[PDB]
DNA sequence: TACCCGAATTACCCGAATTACCCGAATTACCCGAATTACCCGAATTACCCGAATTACCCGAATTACCCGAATTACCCGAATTACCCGAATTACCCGAAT
DNA sequence: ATTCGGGTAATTCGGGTAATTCGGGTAATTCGGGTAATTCGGGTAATTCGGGTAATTCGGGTAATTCGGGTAATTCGGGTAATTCGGGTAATTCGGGTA
C-alpha cells in the first residue's frame, strides 16, 4: 500500500495536520500506525475523498 | 493542486466569504469540501478569474 | 502576490463623489476595474491613491 | 524465512530507512545482520505490524 | 559436510550472490571448490552466521 | 581400491551426477567403469580435491 | 599349483562398488565366468576380475 | 587313486572345509575315510564338479 | 604275501608315512618288520580298508 | 638238501632291494651259502621264519 | 666214490645245471663223465663245498 | 455630477459545527564521511528435460561361514635303515643233437 | 624227459651317497553338531549414461544503499478562539435617463 504522511494529507485538503488527526480518530479516515505511533493514511482513499467519491 | 480557503478567496475580491459560498453554491466557482463540510477553492481557478477569464 | 482592492462606495467616498460616478470613470477607463463573479466592480487601491496625489 | 531490506521496510510504513534502523536498535523489530553490517528484517513480522498485530 | 550454492546463501541473507562471493574472497566465510571453480559454502557456518555467531 | 558412485561423489561437491561425469570425461577425475558402464571414482581422489590438493 | 584362485560374489562386488545381485547378473550375462559350488553359489576367477578393473576385455 | 584332503577341496571351491564335509555328508561327494575317520576325496571327482559335470 | 612300504600305504590314503606307523602301533594294521626295523604292510589288508571292510 | 632262496627271492618277500638283503647277511642277520661263483643263497626255513618275527 | 647228477648238484646250490657244467668246465668241481658224456660230480666234494671248505 | 427607478448582487445577525493555533514531550527527517551491497558485462561451469539401460533393492528359501573341545593328523629332528648309483664278473635262459 | 654244447640279458657281486624310516613331541587340521550372514530364484523403483539449452557463477567496476551519530521539523496529546457552515432581511450595486 502507498501511504501519505499527515503533512501531505493536510496539504491536499488545505487543512492542518491536527485536523487530519481529529479527522482520523473520528473514524472518517482509515489510518495505519508507525512503530513510533505516528499515523499514515491510504493514498487511494485520500484521493477518492478529494475527488468526492463516497 | 493548491487550494484557497474561502477566507482567502474572499479577501481577493473584497467580498464577504458568505458570498464566496453563494458563488460555489450556484456553480460559478468549483468547490472542494474537507471531510467536515468546509469548502476550499482552487487557487488556479481564482487567479484566472481575477484576470477575467470565464470558467 | 495579492492586489488590494477597493469597493466602489469605498472609492467614491474617497473623492466625495457618488458610486454611480465611479462606474462612469470605469466605463470610460480612467480607472482600472476588476469584476466580482456577480458583476460588481472593485478597484486597485494602489491606483486610486495614486490619482489622489495626482499622478497619471 | 523471507527477508526485507531496510529500504523496503521503510517504504511500507512511509518512513526513512535511517528510522527503521532506530526501530531495531530500540528492539521494536527483529534484525538480521549481513556479514557486512547491514540489517535485514523478517517479512512476516513486519507485515504483522502494519495491520497492527503486536 | 553439507553445502550450499552461492545462490542459496544469497537467498538466505537476502543479499546478492555476487556479495556472498565478495565475503568469500575476504575470508568472512569458508569457501570450497568444485573442479570447475564454483564455490560451495558449509551449511553449518552460514546457518550460524544468520543466528549471529562468528 | 575403495570407490564412490557418482551419486555420492556429487553429494560431496553440491553438484549433479552429470557434472561429475563431465569432470571424468574431461580428465580431472580417475574413473573406473563397471561391466554395465556406470563410472565409479577413486575414494581418496575426491577428498583430496576437497582441500585443494590435485 | 593347478588351481584357479576364486572370489565370492560379495568380494567381487566390493571391488566394483556394486551389489552382489548385480555381479550375480553379470554372470548370467556372460560378462564373467561362474563357478558353481556343489550347493549353488557362484565363485569367480580372481584373474578375470582384476583384469576388467583396468579396462581389458 | 590320487586323493585330496578336505582342506584341498575347500581351497579349490573357495569354501570352508566344514562345508566340503557337510557335502560328503549330504552325499554330494564320494568320501574315503582314513583309519582315524578323516575324510579324503578323489581328485578326478572334484575336478569334474569344478568344470560343471554332475556324477 | 604282496607287501607295501609305509610310503606306499601313505600315498594311498593321502597321509603321512608317520601316520601309517601310528596306525600300525594302534593295531589297525598288520605290520611286518624287516630285519632292520622298517615295517611293511599287507596289501590285501590295505586295499581292503580303502574300500570299507574291516 | 636245504631249500634255498636267491637274494632276489628273499628281497621280494620283504619288499626290499636285494642289495640290502646282502647287507643283512654281511651284517649277520642271515645265513649265507656262497655259490662257487660268489653269489649268496639263503635258507628258506630261516627266511620263512623271520617273516613271522622269529629271532 | 658216491656221485650226484648235475641237477642234484644244481638243486642243492640253488642254481641252473649249466652253471654246474660251467663250474666243472672251469676247474672248481671234479667231474667224471659217464660213457655217453654226461658228467657226474663227487657227492663228498660237493657237500664239503656247501659248507665251504676249499 | 448628482439623484431618479427595477433588478440584482452583496453585507450583516445567529446557533451549531468545524477547523486553527497554543503549551511540551516525543518521534521523525535529512545532515556527513566511510563502508557495504546492487547491478552491468562475456567465457565458462552447472542444472535439469529425454529414453534406453544399468544398478539397487524387497522377498522366503537354502547354502555357506564360523562358534567349541576332543581326536587325529602334519611337520621339526637326529640316527639308523634302506634305495639306487658305478663297472666287472656270475648266473639264467633262448635255438639243435645226444644221452 | 634230462645234458652237451654255446651266446645273450638279467642278476649279483664289490663299495658310496641321497632318500626313507624309525622314535618321540607340538601346532595345524578334521572331527562330532548349532546360529547368523550370504546367495539363491524374479521383479519394480531409483540411479546413470548418452547428448542439448538455459540459468548460474567465475573473472572486475561505478553508482546506490546503509552505517554510525546528531540537531531541526514534525507529530504525537488537549483546549480555547476564530471560520465556516446553513438560513434570513436589509444595503449596495448593476443596467440606463434628466435635470
Numbering used by the authors:
A (entry chain D), D (entry chain C), E (entry chain L), F (entry chain K), I (entry chain G), K (entry chain A): 9 to 62
B (entry chain O), H (entry chain H): 9 to 63
C (entry chain P): 7 to 62
G (entry chain Y): 6 to 62
J (entry chain B): 8 to 62
Copied sentences from the primary study:
Like BldD and BldO, BldC acts as a repressor to sustain vegetative growth, and so deletion of bldC causes the premature onset of sporulation. bldC encodes a 68-residue protein that is predicted to contain a winged helix-turn-helix (wHTH) motif, suggesting it may be involved in DNA binding. While BldC appears to contain a MerR-like wHTH, it is to date, the only known MerR-like protein that consists entirely of a wHTH with no obvious effector or oligomerization domain. Using a battery of structural, biochemical, and in vivo approaches, we show here that BldC functions as a pleotropic regulator of Streptomyces development by employing a unique mode of DNA binding for a transcription factor that involves asymmetric head-to-tail oligomerization on DNA direct repeats of varying number with concomitant distortion of the DNA.
To deduce the molecular basis for this extended binding we next determined the structure of BldC in complex with an 18mer smeA-ssfA DNA fragment that contained the first two repeats of the smeA-ssfA BldC binding site, 5′-GCAATTCGGTCGAATTTC-3′. The DNA was constructed to generate pseudo-continuous packing of the DNA, which was indeed generated in the crystals. The structure was solved by molecular replacement (MR) and refined to Rwork/Rfree values of 20.9%/27.8% to 3.09 Å resolution. The structure reveals a striking extended protein-nucleic acid filament with multiple BldC subunits arranged in the same head-tail manner as observed in the BldC-whiI opt structure. The asymmetric BldC dimer contacts and DNA docking mode in this structure are identical to those observed in the BldC-whiI opt structure. Indeed, due to the continuous stacking of the DNA, it was possible that the 9 bp sites bound by each BldC subunit are statistically disordered (half of the time containing one 9 bp sequence and the other half, the other 9 bp sequence). To address the possibility that the DNA may be statistically disordered, X-ray intensity data were collected on a crystal grown with DNA containing a thymine to 5-iododeoxyuracil substitution (5′-GTAAXTCGGTCGAATTTC-3′, where X is 5-iododeoxyuracil). An electron density difference map revealed no strong electron density peaks for the iodine indicating that the DNA is statistically disordered. While the DNA contacts in this structure are statistically disordered, the structure reveals how multiple BldC subunits can bind a promoter site with multiple cognate repeats to create an extended protein superstructure. This superstructure results in a continuous electropositive patch that tracks along the length of the DNA. The binding of multiple BldC subunits along the DNA also leads to severe DNA distortion and shortening: the BldC subunits reduce the length of the DNA by a third when compared to canonical B-DNA.
